[PDB]
Design a protein around this ligand. Structure first.
Ligand SMILES: Nc1nc2c(ncn2[C@@H]2O[C@H](COP(=O)(O)OP(=O)(O)NP(=O)(O)O)[C@@H](O)[C@H]2O)c(=O)[nH]1
Ligand SMILES: *P(=O)(O)OC[C@H]1O[C@@](C#N)(c2ccc3c(N)ncnn23)[C@H](O)[C@@H]1O
Ligand SMILES: [Mg+2]
Ligand SMILES: [Zn+2]
Lengths: 113, 311, 104, 50
């Protein structure tokens, strides 16, 4: 056996934007994993079409993290809402293993057709 | 001869069929082989014991045995459908071995089987393990690999000190006879990654799922995305194999006119020293899905970890 | 954790480096001059394959140094009251000096 | 000499490798031969090409 994600990951709320100041309000579904100091989020997903800036403050409250996003990827899934035409975005520079775990858990327990 | 011979006739399918049970009747065959493992219980690159296949060797004309095998797995029913789905998604790549799904009655139940056709006795993991854990009193796998692919013959292992690098530096000439096999394996790996990206398949590539001809199998840990978004993970494959590319001198064919070993060497300009574009072409041809940035000139690196990586 | 710090994690993990360093310092102690060495190691761990033996050095040198190390130029000592068989061209002796015993 | 300027002006940016200057501009060659078998295959006769 050689596997992708033995144990899974999580997600809390998040905000994003397009321009430098479009960092307005809670706008994504950003997954994350726990690091010893500072927690790194993996995948940005919501009903966003062209968004470049995904934002959240510093643990100190002093700064606020800045992120640039990639080009989009298509997918439509199943829910009692029905076909959710979404776009999920990966932060800049996400390597292949992290995308692998994200897509793994998502397509595993989050519907998709 | 209605349960050992009926099985042997169903395994042949519609291809050439001169097989022989490399074992006993319709029970399995156990062997000691090298694997690259990672689940939530165990990890490592070690030698384990395989226990769930029945292997048949193909005969040639004159009834001479050749290096082509049929490996018939046996397992549960959900893995069967999952593997069939993924295989039918990927079945048109030339770098994928040919599969065959069927059901058969063992005693009173219909058990599902998966057959893999014209495999090789050893994988790439066996070669890498043989060369990275060398012991001169226990090296039967290495000798068998060397003899099978016509690098040397069985009398080469009598002029003892045959393995030493300082005494008998002729062993480099023998190791360099395995190089074109390794180069062909690399090219097929890139093909397979492209197919995976197009179909929408996600999974990690390991050395024990490729035979010594270059073909791939075992899609049991692979999942599905939407087409155009597949992700191959290649980080232990390439780096575990890295020391073997300079020992076998795999990239030698790139000094010839058309990457053809039967042709003259390339004639270069005598005042040329840059070669930056050629390095990028080589990197794109053999390591297309290695996802860390490569700087041909190390004056543009970010720290000393980057310098090590790119050098 | 060693597997997933080699082939799955992409940056440095400081806690596990500290942990592995402590493990090595406890079960594998080294005295190093410029390419000479003496090691004191745990025997029970080495017989189960949890720390390096003399064969692991042979394999590592074969694939990372392009040399063959013969086991007729290595040594081992199972009694600690006679020190290293050799270090910087010196032998060792446990002699009585005054009131106690010292190594010369 | 003029051989030096000839190869230097054929370079696109002015730079050349140092290993090709004696190989292309030197006037005199020296060969060191270990045994007769090597002599037969390298410089037998009174003119050879290298
Ligand atoms: N190429 C090859 N490998 C063989 C043969 N017989 C045994 N093996 C070994 O058995 C392995 C095949 O195992 P298999 O049951 O197909 O599953 P797997 O390779 O572990 N991949 P998975 O992670 O999906 O289980 C090879 O990697 C190799 O180590 C043979 O005839 N040919
Ligand atoms: P995987 O590639 O699916 O199987 C490779 C090979 O390794 C085993 C052997 N035996 C093995 C050893 C230990 C474990 C664990 N903990 N989990 C799953 N598999 N193994 C397998 O039997 C298999 O043959
Ligand atoms: Mg299996
Ligand atoms: Zn670099």
């Amino acid at each position: 056996n050689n596997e992708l994600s033995p144990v899974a990951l999580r997600q809390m709320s998040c905000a994003a934007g397009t321009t430098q100041t479009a960092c307005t309000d809670d706008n994504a579904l950003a997954y994350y994993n726990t690091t010893k100091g500072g927690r790194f989020v993996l995948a940005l997903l919501s009903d966003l079409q062209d968004l470049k800036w995904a934002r959240f403050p510093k643990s100190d409250g002093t700064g606020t993290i800045y992120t640039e996003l990639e080009p989009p990827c298509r997918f439509v899934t199943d829910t009692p809402k029905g076909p959710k035409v979404k776009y999920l975005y990966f932060i800049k520079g996400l390597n292949n293993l992290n995308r692998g775990m994200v897509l793994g858990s998502l397509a595993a327990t989050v519907r998709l057709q | 001869s209605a349960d050992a011979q009926s099985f042997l006739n169903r395994v042949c399918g519609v291809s050439a069929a001169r097989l022989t049970p490399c074992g006993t009747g319709t029970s399995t065959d156990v062997v000691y082989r090298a694997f690259d493992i990672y689940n939530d219980k165990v990890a490592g690159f070690a030698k384990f014991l395989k226990t769930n296949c029945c292997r048949f060797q193909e005969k040639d004309e004159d009834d001479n045995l050749i290096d082509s095998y049929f490996v018939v797995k046996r397992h549960t029913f959900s893995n069967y459908q999952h593997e069939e789905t993924i295989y039918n998604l990927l079945k048109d790549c030339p770098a994928v071995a040919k599969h065959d799904f069927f059901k058969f009655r063992i005693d009173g139940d219909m058990v599902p089987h998966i057959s893999r056709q014209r495999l090789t006795k050893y994988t790439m993991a066996d070669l890498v393990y043989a060369l990275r854990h060398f012991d001169e009193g226990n090296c039967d796998t290495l000798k068998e690999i060397l003899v099978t692919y016509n690098c040397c013959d069985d009398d080469y292992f009598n002029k003892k000190d045959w393995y030493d690098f300082v005494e008998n530096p002729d062993i480099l000439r023998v190791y360099a006879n395995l190089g074109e096999r390794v180069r062909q394996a690399l090219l097929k790996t890139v093909q397979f990654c492209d197919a995976m990206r197009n179909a929408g398949i996600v999974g990690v590539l390991t050395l024990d799922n490729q035979d010594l001809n270059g073909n791939w199998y075992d899609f049991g840990d692979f999942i599905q995305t939407t087409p155009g978004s597949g992700v191959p993970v290649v980080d232990s494959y390439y780096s575990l194999l890295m020391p073997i590319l300079t020992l076998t001198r795999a990239l030698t064919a790139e000094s010839h006119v058309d990457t053809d070993l039967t042709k003259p060497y390339i004639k270069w300009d005598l005042l040329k020293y840059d070669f930056t574009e050629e390095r990028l072409k080589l990197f794109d041809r053999y390591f297309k899905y290695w996802d860390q940035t490569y700087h041909p000139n190390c004056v543009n690196c970010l720290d000393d970890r980057c310098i090590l990586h790119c050098a | 954790r060693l597997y997933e710090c080699l082939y799955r994690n992409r940056d440095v993990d400081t806690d596990f480096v500290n942990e592995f360093y402590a493990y090595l310092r406890k079960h594998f102690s080294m005295m190093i001059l410029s390419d000479d060495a003496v090691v004191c190691f745990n025997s029970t761990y080495a017989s189960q394959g949890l720390v390096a033996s003399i064969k692991n050095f042979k394999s590592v040198l074969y694939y990372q140094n392009n040399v063959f190390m013969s086991e007729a130029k290595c040594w081992t000592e199972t009694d600690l009251t006679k020190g290293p068989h050799e270090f910087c061209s010196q032998h060792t002796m446990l002699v009585k000096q005054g009131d106690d015993y010292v190594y010369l | 000499n003029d051989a030096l300027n000839n190869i230097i002006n054929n370079a696109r940016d002015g730079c050349v490798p140092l290993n090709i200057i004696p190989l292309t501009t030197a006037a005199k060659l020296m060969v060191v031969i270990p045994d007769y078998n090597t002599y037969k295959n390298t410089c037998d006769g009174t003119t050879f090409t290298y």
